[PDB]
Design a protein around this ligand. Structure first.
Ligand SMILES: [Ca+2]
Ligand SMILES: [Mn+2]
Ligand SMILES: [Mn+2]
Length: 430
DNA sequence: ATTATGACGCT
DNA sequence: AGCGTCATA
């Protein structure tokens, strides 16, 4: 009852750019705007692999991971933008720099956690308190929430999408307890007002549109964000969770999309997140471990305490390339040339990082895959990263992997290598 | 031949 | 440390 924590102490948002690499290319090339279009890497093999898809193209059934030749079968007028190639590999610099544009704007509002190239979490708890005292107990107008959905509304006793959105928003605002500075629903609402402002700032200053979720923790904020994309934001209140979770497939919740989520489903014989409430914490811990069990017990009730980490910059800088099928590297000269290509891009990014961010990487991680191995990585070895020099890094990388060569012939490499990966880690301030 | 990443957990 | 899981464009 009175001592039952309800996980309503924070206001957390997740902001995620719509079709992000597509928007980056559409900003650059106005001919691609408002068209079915996609971003592709490489070209020779089946027109290249698709990694981002505009909402116009999604309407034709175009998806990520599709070959462009195959996407063209669904959407013959599909427009394509190719990822840059440098040193024989895809180079994602344009998108990393565009990401920085967005992250720097968000950081003006609050501490952010960079969660991917195109999204960040925001802890808005403090900003909400300040906006609340500024408002002087004044009601919140629907005009301050022009792109917000309230999940679960309208309900109770119009056939247009925007009309439904407004109906739900009106019901929500009509009910609001604006006299209480500590009502969690009011706090989320003010959070949503700030996120409208954040999203308006991002679009004004970059041209990029985004969606957002506003809730009491990161998992619900992430889930909320996807409920009404593109170019909209969704408030998921504590109260909305039972109905929301009652038909929510378990795999939709962050961290349950894989083997663990599959095991929750199989072992417990359930399908939806809400069904987890019928197990004791000990029962869940017995099947899924102490940490996962406690997390599941609280999460199915809408409660999670994972903090928004103060981290705007990536913790690692990596360069990787696959060498599929017949392109697998079979000679020492081959392996060494590509290590050099990778190491040269890595040096470029590392040197830029050192100047921009006042830090230095101190460890080099080298990873490879061998033909025949199903695993993403076959072997991972580390060595010291003492100098930002590509020739040294590539020589060092070779030294730590060269004994993987099962060939009796030195010149040859067996089994052939189907992936190389160089990753700079363990940064220290400089 | 689904590619290039990046964070974090386990032992 | 090296490996595995889960995640996003
Ligand atoms: Ca996105
Ligand atoms: Mn994203
Ligand atoms: Mn996506």
């Amino acid at each position: 009852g009175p001592h039952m924590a309800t996980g309503q102490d924070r206001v957390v948002a997740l902001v995620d750019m719509d079709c992000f690499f597509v928007q980056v290319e559409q900003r650059q090339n106005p001919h691609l705007r408002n068209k079915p279009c996609a971003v592709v890497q490489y070209k020779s093999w089946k027109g290249g692999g698709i990694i981002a898809v505009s909402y116009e193209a999604r309407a034709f059934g175009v998806t990520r991971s599709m070959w462009a030749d195959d996407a063209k079968k669904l959407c013959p007028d599909l427009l394509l933008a190719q990822v840059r190639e440098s040193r024989g590999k895809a180079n994602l610099t344009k998108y990393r720099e565009a990401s920085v544009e967005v992250m720097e704007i968000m950081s003006r509002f609050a501490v952010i956690e960079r969660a991917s190239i195109d999204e960040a979490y925001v802890d808005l708890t403090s900003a909400v308190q300040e906006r609340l005292q500024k408002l002087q107990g004044q009601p919140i107008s629907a005009d301050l929430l022009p792109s917000t959905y309230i999940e679960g509304l309208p309900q109770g006793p119009t056939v247009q999408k925007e009309g439904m959105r407004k109906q739900g928003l009106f019901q929500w605002l009509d009910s609001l307890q604006i006299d209480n500075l500590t009502s969690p629903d009011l706090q989320l609402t003010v959070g949503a007002v700030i996120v409208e402002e954040m999203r308006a700032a991002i679009e004004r200053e970059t041209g990029f549109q985004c969606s957002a979720g506003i809730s009491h923790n990161k998992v619900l904020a992430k889930l909320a964000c996807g409920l009404n994309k593109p170019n909209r934001q969704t408030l998921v209140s504590h109260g909305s969770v039972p109905q929301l979770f009652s038909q929510m497939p378990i795999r939709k919740i962050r961290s349950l999309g894989g083997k663990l989520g599959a095991s929750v489903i199989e072992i417990l014989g359930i399908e939806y997140m809400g069904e987890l409430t019928q197990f004791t914490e000990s029962q869940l811990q017995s099947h899924f471990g102490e940490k996962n069990g406690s997390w599941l017990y609280a999460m199915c009730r809408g409660i999670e305490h994972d903090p928004v980490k103060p981290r705007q910059l990536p913790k690692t800088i990596g360069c990787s390339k696959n060498f599929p099928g017949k392109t697998a590297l079979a000679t020492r000269e081959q392996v060494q040339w590509w290590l050099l290509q990778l190491a040269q891009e890595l040096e470029e990014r590392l040197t830029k990082d050192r100047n921009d961010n006042d830090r230095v990487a101190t460890q080099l991680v080298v990873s490879i895959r061998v033909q025949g191995d199903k695993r993403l990585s076959s072997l991972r070895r580390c060595c010291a990263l003492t100098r930002y020099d590509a020739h040294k890094m590539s020589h060092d990388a070779f030294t730590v992997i060269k004994n993987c060569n099962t060939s009796g012939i030195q010149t040859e490499w067996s089994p052939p290598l189907t992936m190389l990966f160089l990753c700079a880690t363990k940064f220290s301030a400089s």
